[PDB]
Amino acid sequence: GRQFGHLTRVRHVITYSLSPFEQRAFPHYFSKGIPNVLRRTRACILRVAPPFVAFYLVYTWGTQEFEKSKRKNPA
Protein backbone atom coordinates (compact mmCIF):
# COMPACT_ATOMS: atom_id res chain seq x y z
CA GLY A 1 0.00 0.00 0.00
CA ARG A 2 1.01 3.55 0.76
CA GLN A 3 0.47 5.94 -2.15
CA PHE A 4 1.01 9.69 -2.20
CA GLY A 5 -1.79 11.89 -1.00
CA HIS A 6 -2.72 9.40 1.72
CA LEU A 7 0.51 9.42 3.78
CA THR A 8 0.08 12.00 6.55
CA ARG A 9 -1.12 15.56 7.41
CA VAL A 10 1.34 18.45 6.92
CA ARG A 11 0.77 22.20 7.28
CA HIS A 12 2.64 25.48 6.78
CA VAL A 13 5.82 24.19 5.21
CA ILE A 14 7.24 25.76 2.07
CA THR A 15 9.81 23.96 -0.13
CA TYR A 16 11.97 25.88 -2.54
CA SER A 17 13.64 23.69 -5.16
CA LEU A 18 15.70 24.29 -8.22
CA SER A 19 15.89 22.38 -11.48
CA PRO A 20 18.88 19.93 -11.86
CA PHE A 21 19.79 21.65 -15.12
CA GLU A 22 20.40 24.91 -13.31
CA GLN A 23 22.60 23.83 -10.58
CA ARG A 24 25.82 21.94 -10.18
CA ALA A 25 26.00 18.23 -9.35
CA PHE A 26 29.13 18.77 -7.27
CA PRO A 27 29.05 22.21 -5.58
CA HIS A 28 31.78 22.85 -2.98
CA TYR A 29 32.81 19.12 -3.46
CA PHE A 30 36.25 19.24 -2.03
CA SER A 31 35.76 22.57 -0.19
CA LYS A 32 32.71 21.72 2.01
CA GLY A 33 33.01 18.02 1.24
CA ILE A 34 36.20 16.88 2.97
CA PRO A 35 35.55 18.80 6.28
CA ASN A 36 32.27 16.93 6.49
CA VAL A 37 33.81 13.51 6.17
CA LEU A 38 36.37 14.36 8.88
CA ARG A 39 33.54 15.62 11.11
CA ARG A 40 31.52 12.46 10.44
CA THR A 41 34.62 10.45 11.26
CA ARG A 42 35.17 12.30 14.64
CA ALA A 43 31.57 11.72 15.52
CA CYS A 44 31.89 8.02 15.08
CA ILE A 45 35.49 6.80 15.79
CA LEU A 46 35.00 6.33 19.52
CA ARG A 47 32.07 4.07 18.82
CA VAL A 48 33.32 2.11 15.82
CA ALA A 49 37.18 1.97 16.27
CA PRO A 50 37.68 0.50 19.82
CA PRO A 51 35.90 -2.88 19.30
CA PHE A 52 37.96 -3.41 16.23
CA VAL A 53 41.38 -2.68 17.75
CA ALA A 54 40.47 -5.01 20.59
CA PHE A 55 40.12 -7.73 17.87
CA TYR A 56 43.29 -6.49 16.04
CA LEU A 57 45.20 -6.95 19.24
CA VAL A 58 43.55 -10.32 20.10
CA TYR A 59 44.43 -11.44 16.52
CA THR A 60 48.17 -10.59 16.58
CA TRP A 61 48.68 -11.85 20.13
CA GLY A 62 46.66 -15.01 19.30
CA THR A 63 48.85 -15.75 16.35
CA GLN A 64 52.11 -15.13 18.29
CA GLU A 65 51.15 -17.42 21.15
CA PHE A 66 50.19 -20.22 18.77
CA GLU A 67 53.43 -20.10 16.66
CA LYS A 68 55.68 -19.58 19.65
CA SER A 69 54.03 -22.55 21.34
CA LYS A 70 55.18 -25.18 18.85
CA ARG A 71 58.81 -24.62 19.92
CA LYS A 72 60.61 -25.86 23.08
CA ASN A 73 63.81 -25.66 25.12
CA PRO A 74 64.56 -28.28 28.00
CA ALA A 75 62.52 -31.43 29.03
Partner: protein, 105 residues
Protein backbone atom coordinates in the same frame (compact mmCIF):
# COMPACT_ATOMS: atom_id res chain seq x y z
CA UNK B 1 19.92 18.02 45.88
CA UNK B 2 23.74 18.60 46.08
CA UNK B 3 26.97 17.14 44.54
CA UNK B 4 25.44 13.74 43.67
CA UNK B 5 22.24 15.02 41.96
CA UNK B 6 24.27 17.39 39.84
CA UNK B 7 26.57 14.54 38.96
CA UNK B 8 23.67 12.37 37.80
CA UNK B 9 22.28 15.45 36.09
CA UNK B 10 25.58 16.11 34.31
CA UNK B 11 25.87 12.41 33.33
CA UNK B 12 22.32 12.79 31.85
CA UNK B 13 23.38 16.00 30.15
CA UNK B 14 26.43 14.22 28.82
CA UNK B 15 24.39 11.33 27.34
CA UNK B 16 22.01 13.82 25.85
CA UNK B 17 24.83 15.62 24.03
CA UNK B 18 26.33 12.33 22.92
CA UNK B 19 22.94 11.04 21.74
CA UNK B 20 23.03 13.81 19.17
CA UNK B 21 19.38 14.38 18.25
CA UNK B 22 19.93 17.95 19.39
CA UNK B 23 22.31 18.38 16.45
CA UNK B 24 19.39 17.88 14.08
CA UNK B 25 17.19 20.33 16.03
CA UNK B 26 15.13 17.43 17.30
CA UNK B 27 13.61 17.24 20.67
CA UNK B 28 13.62 13.98 22.70
CA UNK B 29 9.97 13.31 22.14
CA UNK B 30 10.50 13.61 18.30
CA UNK B 31 12.68 10.55 18.46
CA UNK B 32 10.20 8.24 20.31
CA UNK B 33 9.41 4.98 18.45
CA UNK B 34 5.86 4.90 17.20
CA UNK B 35 3.79 2.13 18.75
CA UNK B 36 -0.01 2.34 19.26
CA UNK B 37 0.19 4.23 22.60
CA UNK B 38 2.46 6.72 20.90
CA UNK B 39 0.50 6.89 17.66
CA UNK B 40 -2.52 7.90 19.80
CA UNK B 41 -0.62 10.48 21.78
CA UNK B 42 0.57 12.10 18.53
CA UNK B 43 -3.09 12.13 17.46
CA UNK B 44 -4.19 13.81 20.67
CA UNK B 45 -1.64 16.68 20.32
CA UNK B 46 -2.99 20.12 19.78
CA UNK B 47 -2.67 21.81 16.39
CA UNK B 48 0.42 23.91 17.25
CA UNK B 49 2.58 21.20 18.79
CA UNK B 50 1.57 18.80 16.02
CA UNK B 51 2.62 21.26 13.38
CA UNK B 52 5.95 22.02 15.17
CA UNK B 53 6.67 18.33 15.57
CA UNK B 54 6.25 17.75 11.77
CA UNK B 55 8.52 20.62 10.92
CA UNK B 56 11.20 19.35 13.28
CA UNK B 57 11.07 15.79 11.91
CA UNK B 58 11.20 17.25 8.39
CA UNK B 59 14.10 19.47 9.26
CA UNK B 60 15.97 16.46 10.65
CA UNK B 61 15.17 13.96 7.81
CA UNK B 62 16.40 16.61 5.41
CA UNK B 63 19.61 17.08 7.38
CA UNK B 64 20.00 13.36 7.82
CA UNK B 65 19.68 13.01 4.06
CA UNK B 66 22.53 15.25 3.12
CA UNK B 67 24.33 14.09 6.25
CA UNK B 68 24.78 17.53 7.53
CA UNK B 69 23.94 18.93 10.94
CA UNK B 70 22.77 22.23 12.42
CA UNK B 71 25.16 25.08 13.45
CA UNK B 72 25.97 24.64 17.17
CA UNK B 73 23.81 27.56 18.33
CA UNK B 74 20.71 25.97 16.85
CA UNK B 75 21.18 22.63 18.58
CA UNK B 76 18.52 22.03 21.07
CA UNK B 77 19.75 22.64 24.47
CA UNK B 78 19.20 20.02 27.09
CA UNK B 79 16.58 21.07 29.63
CA UNK B 80 15.15 23.68 27.36
CA UNK B 81 14.06 20.38 25.83
CA UNK B 82 10.32 20.44 26.31
CA UNK B 83 8.87 16.99 26.65
CA UNK B 84 5.60 17.91 24.91
CA UNK B 85 4.44 14.26 24.34
CA UNK B 86 4.93 12.83 27.84
CA UNK B 87 1.62 13.95 29.48
CA UNK B 88 -0.34 12.63 26.49
CA UNK B 89 1.53 9.39 26.34
CA UNK B 90 1.13 8.93 30.04
CA UNK B 91 -2.64 9.27 29.89
CA UNK B 92 -2.97 6.98 26.86
CA UNK B 93 -1.06 4.31 28.76
CA UNK B 94 -3.10 4.89 31.85
CA UNK B 95 -6.25 4.40 29.73
CA UNK B 96 -4.92 1.21 28.22
CA UNK B 97 -3.92 -0.20 31.58
CA UNK B 98 -7.42 0.38 32.93
CA UNK B 99 -8.85 -1.49 29.92
CA UNK B 100 -6.40 -4.22 30.74
CA UNK B 101 -7.49 -4.43 34.39
CA UNK B 102 -11.10 -4.73 33.35
CA UNK B 103 -10.19 -7.46 30.88
CA UNK B 104 -8.93 -9.63 33.78
CA UNK B 105 -12.00 -9.91 35.87
Amino acid sequence: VSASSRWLEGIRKWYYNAAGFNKLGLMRDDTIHENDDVKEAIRRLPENLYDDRVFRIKRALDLSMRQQILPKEQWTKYEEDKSYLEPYLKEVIRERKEREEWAKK
